[PDB]
């Protein structure tokens, strides 16, 4: 058989992306794979994105929404169980993302929805208010294979989608790919019945129809670690701060705050999630600990826990500025979250 059909029972984007990556690396040359999956509360960003610029990382952290960086290109999307994902993989030179797009459009047609491709990566439906995006796609290719993965909005919480994709206003000068915002809708507005299982079946049937074969589905469960080469290491990396946050392209952040005890402005340059240069400007009446902080920050992780550690470490040699340092510490954490 040339097909493989894989259905995930995990709702963890890190698990599901690691499965996708290991399956993809190990895929025989002649195989075509369909992988069908969902993620609970997640924002997934493209390989070259800056999370702090592209989504509300602070709100996500408060609400236990997971950040996942994927290996494909493109922008930032929100997943909950009302969102369904597909991945189609194939070897080159056969691989062509147009084929899998047409398979999804055929599945939607079979369910009674008329959609069409829009721009490079969207599927859109017509509504009384104008065209709405129900799907976003992204792609990855190597010398000898490709995959096309994308979403379908069935019954996603669109108020949460907006919330986590509306970042705090920050002075970030950031390299990387920026998201392209659209107006979206749920398929449930067109088909009130519609379920994840129904959509998975329709996509499955259209995949089988296109290729002229059927195969038995294989279920992948987080209850048994998948016996895929390098799974443990891939999963650990996919889960890590260093991958999801630290892989952001080089950027600068200009942070500033007025305190009762004076103004502080900080300029961080960040590369690979570390502060490679920090500069402090202040009119505090006791600037010494702030000057000490500026030198000590070089090499520090751009992350609240480590920044607060550096602020608070100054209490030993600057105990008279405890009030200032604790205010600075709490502010700075909130400013980089």
Ligand X SMILES: Nc1ncnc2c1ncn2[C@@H]1O[C@H](COP(=O)(O)OC(=O)CCCC[C@@H]2CCSS2)[C@@H](O)[C@H]1O
Binding site for ligand X (CB under 6 A): 44, 70, 74-75, 77-79, 83, 85, 121, 133, 135-138, 149-151, 153, 161, 165, 179-182, 184
Task: CB nearer to ligand X: give 32 or 79.
Answer: 79
Name 258's bridge partners. Answer: 263
What DSSP designation does 119 have? T
Tokens encoding 5: 């059909």
- Binding region for Mg ion (CB under 5 A) out of 123-131, 158-166, 172-180, 213-221: 172-180
Q: Give min distance, CB of 81 to ligand X, in A.
A: 12
Task: CB nearer to ligand X: give 113 or 311.
Answer: 113
165 binds, among ligand X, Mg ion, none (CB under 5 to 8 A by kind): ligand X
Q: Give min distance, CB of 76 to Mg ion, in A.
A: 10
Task: CB nearer to Mg ion: give 177 or 180.
Answer: 180
Comparing C-alpha atoms, which of 84, 106, 85, 90 is closest to residue 207? 106
Q: Give min distance, CB of 102 to Mg ion, in A.
A: 20
CA distance 259 to 76: 34
Cβ burial of 130 (10 Å; 0-12, 13-18, 19+) is exposed
What DSSP designation does 61 have? H
Give the binding-site size for Mg ion (rule: CB under 5 A): 2
Q: Give min distance, CB of 148 to ligand X, in A.
A: 9
Task: CB nearer to ligand X: give 120 or 272.
Answer: 120
Q: Output the known binding site for ATP.
A: 70, 75-78, 133
Q: Give min distance, CB of 124 to ligand X, in A.
A: 10
Please report the beta strands in 9-160, taking only residues with DSSP state E, as ranges in sequence order: 32-37, 42-45, 66-69, 77-79, 83-91, 115-118, 122-125, 132-141, 145-153
CA distance 126 to 36: 25
Q: Does 180 bind Mg ion (CB under 5 A)?
A: yes
Tokens encoding 319: 């105990």
70 binds, among ligand X, Mg ion, none (CB under 5 to 8 A by kind): ligand X
- Say which residues have a Cβ less than 8 Å from residue 290's Cβ, sequence separation at least 6: 264, 280, 282, 284, 328
Q: Cβ distance 134 to 183 under 8 Å?
A: no
CA distance 57 to 172: 14
44 binds, among Mg ion, ligand X, none (CB under 5 to 8 A by kind): ligand X
78 binds, among Mg ion, ligand X, none (CB under 5 to 8 A by kind): ligand X
Cα 158 to the center of its chain, rounded Å: 17
The 122-161 contact track toward Mg ion, x by CB under 5 A, reads ----------------------------------------
Cis peptide before 93 (omega within 30 of 0): yes
Task: CB nearer to Mg ion: give 182 or 198.
Answer: 182
Q: Does 182 bind Mg ion (CB under 5 A)?
A: yes
- Binding region for Mg ion (CB under 5 A) out of 21-29, 61-69, 179-187, 188-196: 179-187
Q: Output the known binding site for (R)-lipoate.
A: 133
Residue 90 phi/psi, 5-degree rounding, is -160, 160
Task: CB nearer to ligand X: give 149 or 253.
Answer: 149
What DSSP designation does 301 have? B
Residues that bind Mg ion (CB under 5 A): 180, 182
């Amino acid at each position: 058989s040339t097909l493989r059909l894989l259905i995930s029972d995990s709702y963890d984007p890190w698990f599901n992306l690691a499965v996708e990556e290991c399956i993809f690396r190990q895929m025989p040359a002649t195989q075509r794979v369909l992988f069908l999956w969902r993620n609970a509360d997640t924002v997934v960003i493209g390989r070259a994105q800056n999370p702090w610029k592209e989504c509300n990382t602070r709100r996500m952290e408060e609400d236990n929404v997971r950040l996942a960086r994927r290996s494909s290109g493109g922008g930032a999307v929100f997943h909950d169980l009302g969102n369904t994902c597909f991945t189609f993989m194939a070897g080159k030179p056969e691989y062509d993302k147009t084929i899998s797009t047409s398979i999804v459009l055929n599945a939607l047609n079979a369910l009674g929805v008329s959609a069409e491709a829009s721009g490079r990566n969207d599927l859109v439906v017509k509504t009384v208010e104008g065209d709405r995006k129900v799907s976003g796609s992204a792609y990855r290719e190597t010398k000898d294979r490709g995959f096309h993965h994308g979403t379908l909005l069935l019954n996603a919480d669109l108020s949460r989608l907006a919330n986590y994709l509306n970042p705090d206003k920050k002075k970030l000068a950031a390299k990387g790919i920026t998201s392209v915002r659209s107006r979206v809708t749920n398929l449930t507005e067109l088909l009130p019945g519609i379920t994840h299982e129904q959509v998975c079946e329709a996509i499955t049937e259209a995949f089988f129809a296109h290729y002229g074969e059927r195969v038995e589905a294989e279920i992948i469960s987080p209850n048994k670690t998948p016996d895929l080469p390098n799974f443990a290491e891939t999963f650990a990396r996919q889960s890590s701060w260093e991958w999801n946050f630290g892989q952001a392209p080089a950027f600068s952040h200009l942070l500033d705050e007025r305190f009762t005890w004076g103004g502080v402005e900080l300029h961080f340059d960040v590369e690979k999630g570390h502060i490679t240069r920090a500069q402090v400007f202040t009119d505090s009446l006791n600037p010494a600990p702030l000057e000490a902080l500026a030198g000590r920050l070089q090499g520090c992780l751009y992350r609240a826990d480590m920044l607060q550690q550096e602020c608070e470490a100054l209490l030993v040699d600057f105990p008279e500025q405890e009030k200032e340092l604790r205010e600075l510490s709490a502010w700075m954490a909130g400013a980089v979250r």
